[PDB]
């Protein structure tokens, strides 16, 4: 007898492997939610997940990649309840689909590595920023193809992830430097291509991942380099700003409260930025390469109704 909310199902398998990421872990928790708890009626099933997704937003309010996972699972079970099976087969007809994304969204990243080959060409110095793991699997395919390139890793401050990526692919055997994020503007002229990855895509095409992907994006547009971004086909959320201000973590990005005893002072600003359509130029899906205008329409094609 589980409850699927916090850790009695969900945070079990987040300590199982750091190959599954946050939103499909919620998708893995949401598909097994109605699988065991199948209350033989179409009404309270969706009322179970509306209780369960809204407390899951309440569980971690500042991991809005989960909110994209909370978004499209409702978009999954809506059309899966469509084809009009009167809930008779649609109990089984949903769970015979069932384990799709643990067989399909797990193979997002290698399918990204199938079609993201011909971006990193011969002798491209590559600017990466933040642990967006689809980039590394694209770089895993690049080392396994023995195609020639180099790599440059920025910081990820304060999220520390840039120190991991230097250790992650030096053992793989790529010539690489870790650079500070402060030294982007004096180095970007030698840099030719640049790869990042969003935690979620907004309505105009959003980069809702890290602290300064918009900073390195607006550098690259004045450098006039193709600012690519690597993601997959389950990373879409309706949450869409008008400025570069999303929901913050807890407070406004200009706090002026004081240090009580020894409180952290680098952690006063934001941790999530926003980039509109203007500064990206292409992105990757499991559907294929995608222009920043088509990422608006496919995020609206089944979203208005």
């Amino acid at each position: 007898m589980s409850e699927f909310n916090i850790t009695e199902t969900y945070l079990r398998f987040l300590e199982e492997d750091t190959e599954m990421t946050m939103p499909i872990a919620a998708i893995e928790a949401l598909v097994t939610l109605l699988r065991i708890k199948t209350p033989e009626t179409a009404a309270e099933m969706i009322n179970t997940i509306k209780s369960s997704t809204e407390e899951l937003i309440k569980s971690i309010p500042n991991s809005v990649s989960l909110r994209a996972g909370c978004d499209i699972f409702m978009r999954f079970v809506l059309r899966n309840l469509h084809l009009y099976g009167d809930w008779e087969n649609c109990k089984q007809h949903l769970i015979e689909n069932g384990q799709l994304f643990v067989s399909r969204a797990k193979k997002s990243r290698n399918k990204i590595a199938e079609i993201g080959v011909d971006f990193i060409a011969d002798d491209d110095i590559i600017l990466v920023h933040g642990y967006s793991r689809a980039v590394f699997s694209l770089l895993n395919h690049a080392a396994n193809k023995f195609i020639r390139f180099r790599c440059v890793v920025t910081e990820s401050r304060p999220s520390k992830q840039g120190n991991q990526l230097y250790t992650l692919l030096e053992q793989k055997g790529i010539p690489v430097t870790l650079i500070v994020d402060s030294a982007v503007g004096a180095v970007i002229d030698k840099v030719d291509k640049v790869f990042v990855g969003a935690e979620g895509v907004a309505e105009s095409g959003g980069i809702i991942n890290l602290v300064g992907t918009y900073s390195v994006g607006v550098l690259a547009h004045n450098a006039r380099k193709p600012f690519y971004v690597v993601t997959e086909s389950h990373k879409f959320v309706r949450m869409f700003p008008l400025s570069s201000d999303d929901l913050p973590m807890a407070g406004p990005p200009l706090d002026f409260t004081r240090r009580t005893d020894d409180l952290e002072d680098a952690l006063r600003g934001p941790t999530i930025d926003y980039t509109a359509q203007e500064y990206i130029t292409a992105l990757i899906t499991d559907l294929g390469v995608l222009t920043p205008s088509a990422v608006s329409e496919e995020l609206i094609k089944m979203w208005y109704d």
Partner: protein, 249 residues
Amino acid sequence: TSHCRFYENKYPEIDDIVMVNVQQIAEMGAYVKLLEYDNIEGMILLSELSRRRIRSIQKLIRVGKNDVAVVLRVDKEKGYIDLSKRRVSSEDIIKCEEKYQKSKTVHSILRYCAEKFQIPLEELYKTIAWPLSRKFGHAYEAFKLSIIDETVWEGIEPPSKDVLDELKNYISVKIRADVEVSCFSYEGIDAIKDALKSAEDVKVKLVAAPLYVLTTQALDKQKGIEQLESAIEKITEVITKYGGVCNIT
């Protein structure tokens, strides 16, 4: 106290034609409520609405307002029951809604018999239901019987007797005419008498010798169109055969 049970089951048991109103739709479908058990609520899924995918501008016009439906499935203890209005014939609009309208008019009489008498509504409802709405059809057609078939009032005990008086007060319109008899004759009185003897047998009042105020009763408000006109015609007929002059407003 405001509303309660109809027919002694907590849920509308499988395949009974009911009525709901749609409250809001976000992604599931409508969060309807069962208008026979008003405070309880079920829901409907989007494929069980109109088959054409309903646009959001088509969606907003239908909230608040009510319609007719049947129930697909029933949770025995949860209220979360599955609706069906797509697979409903047009005859159930005639069947269920007028039956529900025949149960809306007993809501009009059992409200002032309950709260203006300061008792909860269900206890003087559940004295009625089983010998009326289970013995035969529900009691509003019997309430037009019980005004003349008084084996029903004695067929159940009255817990109060204000309700017996407040029923026949409720369940059991004047068109004004200022007709001007401007006569200058000798056989006019007789004519007037004759007129009275057909137009009154509706409410006719003498004001003076010329002016007469007659307030003709209408049933559909438009059924006194055929009455007033008739009266006028009669008046016209009357005064040519006697010697005087009648003029109508």
